[PDB]
Amino acid sequence: RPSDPGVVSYAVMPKGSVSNIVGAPIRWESEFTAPFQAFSVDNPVCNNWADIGLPEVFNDPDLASFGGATAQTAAGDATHLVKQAVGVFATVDAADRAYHRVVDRTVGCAGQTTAMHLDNFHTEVWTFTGGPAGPADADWVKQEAGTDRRCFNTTRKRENVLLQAKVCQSGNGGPAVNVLAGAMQNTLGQL
Amino acid sequence: RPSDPGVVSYAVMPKGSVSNIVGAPIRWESEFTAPFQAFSVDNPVCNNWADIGLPEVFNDPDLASFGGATAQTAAGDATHLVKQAVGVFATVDAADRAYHRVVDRTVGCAGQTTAMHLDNFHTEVWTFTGGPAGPADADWVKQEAGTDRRCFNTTRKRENVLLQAKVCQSGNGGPAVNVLAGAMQNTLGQLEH
Numbered sequence: 001r002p003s004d005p006g007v008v009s010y011a012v013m014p015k016g017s018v019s020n021i022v023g024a025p026i027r028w029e030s031e032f033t034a035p036f037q038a039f040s041v042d043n044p045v046c047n048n049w050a051d052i053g054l055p056e057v058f059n060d061p062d063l064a065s066f067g068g069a070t071a072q073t074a075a076g077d078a079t080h081l082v083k084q085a086v087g088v089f090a091t092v093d094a095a096d097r098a099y100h101r102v103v104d105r106t107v108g109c110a111g112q113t114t115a116m117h118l119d120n121f122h123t124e125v126w127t128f129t130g131g132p133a134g135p136a137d138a139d140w141v142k143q144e145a146g147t148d149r150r151c152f153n154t155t156r157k158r159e160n161v162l163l164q165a166k167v168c169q170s171g172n173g174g175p176a177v178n179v180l181a182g183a184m185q186n187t188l189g190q191l
Numbered sequence: 192r193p194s195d196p197g198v199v200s201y202a203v204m205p206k207g208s209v210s211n212i213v214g215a216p217i218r219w220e221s222e223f224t225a226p227f228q229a230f231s232v233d234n235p236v237c238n239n240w241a242d243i244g245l246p247e248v249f250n251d252p253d254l255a256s257f258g259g260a261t262a263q264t265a266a267g268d269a270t271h272l273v274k275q276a277v278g279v280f281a282t283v284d285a286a287d288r289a290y291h292r293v294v295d296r297t298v299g300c301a302g303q304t305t306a307m308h309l310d311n312f313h314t315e316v317w318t319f320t321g322g323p324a325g326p327a328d329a330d331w332v333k334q335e336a337g338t339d340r341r342c343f344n345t346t347r348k349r350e351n352v353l354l355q356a357k358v359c360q361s362g363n364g365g366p367a368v369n370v371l372a373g374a375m376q377n378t379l380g381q382l383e384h
């Protein structure tokens with residue numbers, strides 16, 4: 001069955017739960033209640049892979065509710081960084097259109113390196129990889145140029161819900177992002 | 192079964208419950224115990240769609256009890272705004288007449304844009320949409336001109352009760368206003384046996 005808009009208050013895992021999933025201290029988080037994009041990317045095809053919880057993906061006449069969080073090792077320390085975004089749509093079709101704004105608009109991003117101009121006047125360079133998106137599930141990775149830092153991303157469309165999770169770290173945040181997306185999905189009350 | 196007048200004391204969802212329903216912080220609320228109208232509209236057929244809990248709808252010889260609340264994100268922040276009004280009438284027919292003061296007097300409002308003059312001296316321009324009212328359920332939407340802000344409204348007649356709920360936000364407050372109206376109805380003690 002479809003989710004009520006209230007599920008966003010429950011579907012975002014708090015920093016304690018995030019710490020238990022990544023296997024590292026997570027002492028800082030910031031919650032958000034609206035989609036936001038805090039950067040511009042040079043290559044437009046990579047916009048909807050460059051972060052999650054984006055306005056062009058989620059903002060829609062049929063967006064009923066939205067919540068997310070960014071969690072980190074500590075204030076000023078993103079050694080581990082974890083982000084979550086959950087949108088509840090009025091219809092299953094609207095959630096499908098939001099899913100397709102992620103996966104249709106990023107065809108050609110895989111294999112590209114591009115500059116992210118952050119709104120705080122920092123510039124980062126990221127290399128994107130990812131296989132073809134599924135009907136309701138899309139994974140991709142970005143790696144920061146000259147580092148072993150990779151962000152593992154997953155997007156999940158479940159009935160009238162679109163959710164996204166991102167785990168950034170050295171090594172492989174993929175296992176953690178899959179455990180986290182599972183934990184988020186388990187709250188949706190869709191049976 | 193009709194509701195006793197006392198149900199208005201617990202039919203209005205507090206800000207904590209409203210927050211759980213809309214899925215966003217709701218830190219501010221103001222309760223009221225009398226119908227009020229804090230505006231005028233240029234086009235009179237849109238009066239009873241322009242807000243809920245109105246005197247011309249609820250005030251009546253057979254109004255037994257009345258309560259409502261307005262709730263917001265925070266004191267000066269209406270990013271989410273939610274309003275509720277519950278009237279208990281002495282008779283089911285009096286509740287039906289109150290329902291018809293909403294739905295009869297707003298025929299022609301759908302498709303109209305009109306100015307709302309607020310008591311605080313501000314002017315807002317709203318575009319009204321809505322299908323024909325049902326026998327006991329009337330829904331409509333108003334959109335603020337030049338914005339994605341929409342207020343989803345539901346008016347429901349249940350035995351001797353008229354209830355109204357309004358959820359204002361960007362995107363679609365429709366699912367939340369339906370959950371909220373359901374939560375309000377669940378307190379009315381109307382299950383027949």
Ligand SMILES: [Mg+2]
Pocket residue numbers: 192193
């Ligand atoms: Mg009876």
